[PDB]
Amino acid sequence: QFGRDIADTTDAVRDPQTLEILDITPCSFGGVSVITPGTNTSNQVAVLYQDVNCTEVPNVFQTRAGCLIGAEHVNNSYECDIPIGAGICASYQSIIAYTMSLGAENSVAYSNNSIAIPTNFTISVTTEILPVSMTKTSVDCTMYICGDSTECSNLLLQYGSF
Amino acid sequence: SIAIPTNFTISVTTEILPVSMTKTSVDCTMYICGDSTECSNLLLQYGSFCTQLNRALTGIAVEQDKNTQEVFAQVKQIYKTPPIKDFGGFNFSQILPDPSKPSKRSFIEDLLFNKVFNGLTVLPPLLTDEMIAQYTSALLAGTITSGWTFGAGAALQIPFAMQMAYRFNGIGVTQNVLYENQKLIANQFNSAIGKIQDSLSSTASALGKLQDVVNQ
Amino acid sequence: NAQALNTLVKQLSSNFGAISSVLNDILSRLDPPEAEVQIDRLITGRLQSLQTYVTQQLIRAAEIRASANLAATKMSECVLGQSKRVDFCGKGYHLMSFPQSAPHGVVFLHVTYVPAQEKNFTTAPAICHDGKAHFPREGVFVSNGTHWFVTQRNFYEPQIITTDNTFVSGNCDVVIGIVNNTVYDPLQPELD
Amino acid sequence: PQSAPHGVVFLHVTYVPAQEKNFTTAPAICHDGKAHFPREGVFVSNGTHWFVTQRNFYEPQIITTDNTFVSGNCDVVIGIVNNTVYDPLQPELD
Ligand SMILES: *[C@@H]1O[C@H](CO)[C@@H](O[C@@H]2O[C@H](CO)[C@@H](O)[C@H](O)[C@H]2NC(C)=O)[C@H](O)[C@H]1NC(C)=O
Ligand SMILES: *[C@@H]1O[C@H](CO)[C@@H](O[C@@H]2O[C@H](CO)[C@@H](O)[C@H](O)[C@H]2NC(C)=O)[C@H](O)[C@H]1NC(C)=O
Numbered sequence: 001q002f003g004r005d006i007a008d009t010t011d012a013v014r015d016p017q018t019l020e021i022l023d024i025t026p027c028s029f030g031g032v033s034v035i036t037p038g039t040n041t042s043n044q045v046a047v048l049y050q051d052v053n054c055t056e057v058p059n060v061f062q063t064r065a066g067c068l069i070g071a072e073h074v075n076n077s078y079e080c081d082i083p084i085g086a087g088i089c090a091s092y093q094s095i096i097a098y099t100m101s102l103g104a105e106n107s108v109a110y111s112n113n114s115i116a117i118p119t120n121f122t123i124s125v126t127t128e129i130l131p132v133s134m135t136k137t138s139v140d141c142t143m144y145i146c147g148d149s150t151e152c153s154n155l156l157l158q159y160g161s162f
Numbered sequence: 163s164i165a166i167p168t169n170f171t172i173s174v175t176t177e178i179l180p181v182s183m184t185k186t187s188v189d190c191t192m193y194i195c196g197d198s199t200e201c202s203n204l205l206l207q208y209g210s211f212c213t214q215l216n217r218a219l220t221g222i223a224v225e226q227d228k229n230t231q232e233v234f235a236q237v238k239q240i241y242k243t244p245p246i247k248d249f250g251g252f253n254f255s256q257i258l259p260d261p262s263k264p265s266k267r268s269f270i271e272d273l274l275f276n277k278v279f280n281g282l283t284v285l286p287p288l289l290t291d292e293m294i295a296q297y298t299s300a301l302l303a304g305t306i307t308s309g310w311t312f313g314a315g316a317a318l319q320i321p322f323a324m325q326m327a328y329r330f331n332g333i334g335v336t337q338n339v340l341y342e343n344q345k346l347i348a349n350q351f352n353s354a355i356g357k358i359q360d361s362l363s364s365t366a367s368a369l370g371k372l373q374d375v376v377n378q
Numbered sequence: 379n380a381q382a383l384n385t386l387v388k389q390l391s392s393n394f395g396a397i398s399s400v401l402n403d404i405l406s407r408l409d410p411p412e413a414e415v416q417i418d419r420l421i422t423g424r425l426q427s428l429q430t431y432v433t434q435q436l437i438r439a440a441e442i443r444a445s446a447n448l449a450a451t452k453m454s455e456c457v458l459g460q461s462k463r464v465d466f467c468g469k470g471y472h473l474m475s476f477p478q479s480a481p482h483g484v485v486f487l488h489v490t491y492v493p494a495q496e497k498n499f500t501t502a503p504a505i506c507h508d509g510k511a512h513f514p515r516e517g518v519f520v521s522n523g524t525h526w527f528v529t530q531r532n533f534y535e536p537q538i539i540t541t542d543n544t545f546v547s548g549n550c551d552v553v554i555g556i557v558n559n560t561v562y563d564p565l566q567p568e569l570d
Numbered sequence: 571p572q573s574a575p576h577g578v579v580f581l582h583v584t585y586v587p588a589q590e591k592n593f594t595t596a597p598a599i600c601h602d603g604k605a606h607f608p609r610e611g612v613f614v615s616n617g618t619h620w621f622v623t624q625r626n627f628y629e630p631q632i633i634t635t636d637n638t639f640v641s642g643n644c645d646v647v648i649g650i651v652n653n654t655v656y657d658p659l660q661p662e663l664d
């Protein structure tokens with residue numbers, strides 16, 4: 001009369017009246033996200049829906065990570081500014097959704113008898129930032145869990161040495 | 163008593179390391195109870211237990227996208243192998259991408275990939291695997307055409323025949339031996355490349371970290 | 379860290395199934411025989427919240443220690459000395475670095491040697507002189523079209539091909555790509 | 571590097587020496603009362619004749635004043651062997 005895919009989850013029920021097996025799937029859901037270029041930079045925002053067929057959510061552009069509203073697809077590829085997912089990124093032109101640009105494609109001149117040797121050098125200082133410690137914090141037991149209450153702390157002792 | 167080698171064997175060793183996992187995101191309002199307004203009331207009165215859990219989960223979800231960033235995106239620009247491939251008798255078609263494959267995947271990568279509901283959702287990775295090979299292709303071109311020069315600054319072309327000479331010079335081996343044994347080295351390298359692909363073609367349980375990480 | 383401390387405070391306001399979020403009210407208007415029932419659920423909820431905070435703190439402590447150990451390692455190699463390993467401290471050929479104090483960490487200033495202004499030359503891997511194959515002791519061969527020169531791999535410092543800065547081995551037939559050129563010898567002018 | 575579904579795969583090209591032969595050696599050579607040391611590599615001998623070669627490959631070469639440097643005396647260092655050091659200038663002078 002019905003079927004379970006895995007982990008005790010029904011995914012197929014046959015209606016006995018009609019005698020025709022039908023698949024069952026949970027309908028669309030997920031987390032809605034907002035794409036913005038910055039409060040001071042601009043005001044327009046674009047709404048993103050994750051893993052939803054873009055036919056019942058409400059410029060609409062469908063992408064591999066669901067469809068987003070408020071951006072226009074651009075064939076031209078630029079450097080990624082806002083990472084949305086599935087290889088698309090958004091930035092400010094209006095909000096534009098474009099395929100991520102991996103980088104500048106250059107074919108260096110290669111040959112069996114060609115050596116590129118620098119004739120000049122530039123010394124540049126690079127700043128690396130690394131944390132080594134965090135704020136030292138301590139939490140008390142009796143006066144926090146209950147607080148200046150002997151009767152309450154008495155029941156706390158029953159839990160042992162947690 | 164001194165024992166000094168009179169010959170050398172060049173062997174390629176495969177090291178497997180995971181760099182990212184599935185970006186999972188978990189809801190709580192529709193997971194703990196599920197489309198139940200009356201039940202959701204008792205969910206929130208516990209405070210903000212699941213509010214931080216989503217923040218904690220999404221906190222690591224973006225980390226994997228970061229993790230892939232430094233491990234792969236280490237090239238300021240994308241390099242392309244020259245159309246003519248004469249690397250002093252060396253063969254690299256196994257690792258380089260081919261048009262026959264999906265326009266970016268190499269023969270070994272294809273061999274590698276092939277060998278590998280309500281309440282939950284999975285976030286797709288920021289860098290799709292299709293263009294992940296693009297970074298490796300760029301690195302392959304840089305480490306072959308430009309050798310190690312492009313790692314410091316601008317990519318400087320260097321023929322592969324004498325690029326090895328520096329590396330041989332870097333391990334206390336005079337470069338003169340390499341040129342006198344260039345043909346032998348190329349044959350050894352090609353055989354090693356051919357052998358490693360066969361070590362994983364039919365059957366191989368050495369995937370280890372890559373294969374098992376999905377399991378848990 | 380600030381939010382982790384802050385989010386813990388709000389947990390005190392949660393009833394965790396009790397009727398009030400403050401202990402005094404529970405001790406006031408509840409019959410003591412059954413008063414502990416509301417307390418027990420309250421303590422478990424608060425204890426659970428406290429358990430989570432410590433666990434989250436422990437996870438961050440391991441991450442900080444890993445970063446701290448990495449920071450110490452960078453200081454060990456890139457500050458106390460020169461890091462031969464490539465791109466471990468600043469892109470380019472690292473020279474040295476200067477640590478700087480930070481409120482909860484350390485900031486380095488990796489002084490790197492970035493080459494620029496490259497030129498491409500027609501070259502060969504070896505030189506044949508009098509039937510003897512010559513190789514460079516250091517650097518590589520270069521030529522500005524006609525004249526040949528030797529320079530280090532990281533800077534263009536052309537020099538005349540000389541016996542002193544080159545070594546011979548084998549014959550002219552075993553190596554491919556060789557070019558025919560004359561190797562200067564400083565002894566001949568002195569002898570003559 | 572090679573792409574993997576959830577990781578990265580390397581192909582470490584390594585230089586593994588093989589076909590090793592054992593030879594009698596000395597740490598230095600005494601010539602005309604001067605202790606000679608190799609600029610690089612170590613001294614080797616195929617029984618009788620002595621040679622200089624690098625530590626990672628057998629490339630014997632004639633002991634020459636240019637591939638060796640002199641320091642100290644013949645007495646302070648132990649294990650030295652008595653042998654002659656060729657000089658490239660003498661044939662040119664003669
Ligand atoms: C190497 O590069 C440096 C700068 O990167 C050059 O120095 C410049 O020289 C010009 C020549 O008049 C000056 O106008 C600039 O003010 C200099 N800049 C600096 C920062 O010093 C140098 O000339 C270059 N040398 C070669 C041989 O190319
Ligand atoms: C060093 O070892 C290689 C192989 O490890 C030797 O190459 C072999 O040479 C024989 C001689 O005819 C051939 O029959 C084999 O087919 C070669 N093998 C390969 C893989 O090329 C080489 O001769 C050795 N050299 C020395 C000096 O011992």
Ligand SMILES: *[C@@H]1O[C@H](CO)[C@@H](O[C@@H]2O[C@H](CO)[C@@H](O)[C@H](O)[C@H]2NC(C)=O)[C@H](O)[C@H]1NC(C)=O
Nearest residue numbers: 506507508509510549550551556557558559560
């Ligand atoms: C440089 O030297 C080589 C080596 O001698 C010369 O090659 C000779 O070319 C002639 C004429 O083709 C042949 O008869 C000889 O047999 C070659 N030598 C060898 C060892 O095979 C070459 O011609 C010289 N000049 C240049 C510009 O390379």
Ligand SMILES: *[C@@H]1O[C@H](CO)[C@@H](O[C@@H]2O[C@H](CO)[C@@H](O)[C@H](O)[C@H]2NC(C)=O)[C@H](O)[C@H]1NC(C)=O
Nearest residue numbers: 600601602603604643644645650651652653654
């Ligand atoms: C190599 O040179 C050493 C150093 O001169 C020689 O040792 C000398 O041996 C004679 C005779 O046994 C002694 O009279 C000398 O006093 C020794 N020299 C010193 C500095 O004490 C050695 O004989 C030579 N030959 C060999 C094979 O080692």
Ligand SMILES: *[C@@H]1O[C@H](CO)[C@@H](O)[C@H](O)[C@H]1NC(C)=O
Nearest residue numbers: 014015016017018019020021
């Ligand atoms: C029972 O089956 C008959 C056969 O076609 C169909 O006409 C009828 O509608 C069915 N009744 C129900 C209640 O499904």
Ligand SMILES: *[C@@H]1O[C@H](CO)[C@@H](O)[C@H](O)[C@H]1NC(C)=O
Nearest residue numbers: 037038039040041042043092
């Ligand atoms: C918005 O604020 C950022 C951060 O200070 C600044 O870099 C940017 O220039 C600002 N843009 C405008 C339009 O004010």
Ligand SMILES: *[C@@H]1O[C@H](CO)[C@@H](O)[C@H](O)[C@H]1NC(C)=O
Nearest residue numbers: 052053054055062063064066
């Ligand atoms: C979304 O649903 C429509 C049918 O309503 C279908 O034609 C389309 O292919 C679906 N899109 C995706 C990405 O599956």
Ligand SMILES: *[C@@H]1O[C@H](CO)[C@@H](O)[C@H](O)[C@H]1NC(C)=O
Nearest residue numbers: 072073074075076077098099
């Ligand atoms: C972009 O690509 C699509 C798909 O091939 C094509 O239909 C369209 O004309 C192209 N140009 C623009 C401006 O969208």
Ligand SMILES: *[C@@H]1O[C@H](CO)[C@@H](O)[C@H](O)[C@H]1NC(C)=O
Nearest residue numbers: 108109110114497498499500
């Ligand atoms: C290589 O050098 C030649 C010299 O004539 C030049 O024409 C060519 O443009 C150079 N290639 C580069 C810089 O890629």
Ligand SMILES: *[C@@H]1O[C@H](CO)[C@@H](O)[C@H](O)[C@H]1NC(C)=O
Nearest residue numbers: 247251252253254255256352
């Ligand atoms: C590299 O190996 C492949 C494997 O069959 C072969 O088809 C190709 O011709 C080889 N290329 C070279 C340059 O040896």
Ligand SMILES: *[C@@H]1O[C@H](CO)[C@@H](O)[C@H](O)[C@H]1NC(C)=O
Nearest residue numbers: 521522523524525526527536
């Ligand atoms: C190359 O450099 C030499 C060195 O002085 C110079 O004499 C010559 O004119 C330059 N050009 C060519 C084509 O050799």
Ligand SMILES: *[C@@H]1O[C@H](CO)[C@@H](O)[C@H](O)[C@H]1NC(C)=O
Nearest residue numbers: 111112113246248554555556
């Ligand atoms: C270098 O490459 C050119 C063109 O590919 C070829 O004509 C020449 O014979 C090659 N020489 C060597 C030494 O590889």
Ligand SMILES: *[C@@H]1O[C@H](CO)[C@@H](O)[C@H](O)[C@H]1NC(C)=O
Nearest residue numbers: 615616617618619620621630
């Ligand atoms: C050692 O090598 C030399 C080098 O030619 C050779 O003459 C000699 O016969 C070899 N054997 C011995 C025992 O010296």
Ligand SMILES: *[C@@H]1O[C@H](CO)[C@@H](O)[C@H](O)[C@H]1NC(C)=O
Nearest residue numbers: 163596597647648649650651
């Ligand atoms: C090396 O060891 C042997 C055997 O113990 C000994 O006869 C000889 O004198 C030693 N020579 C040196 C230089 O240590």
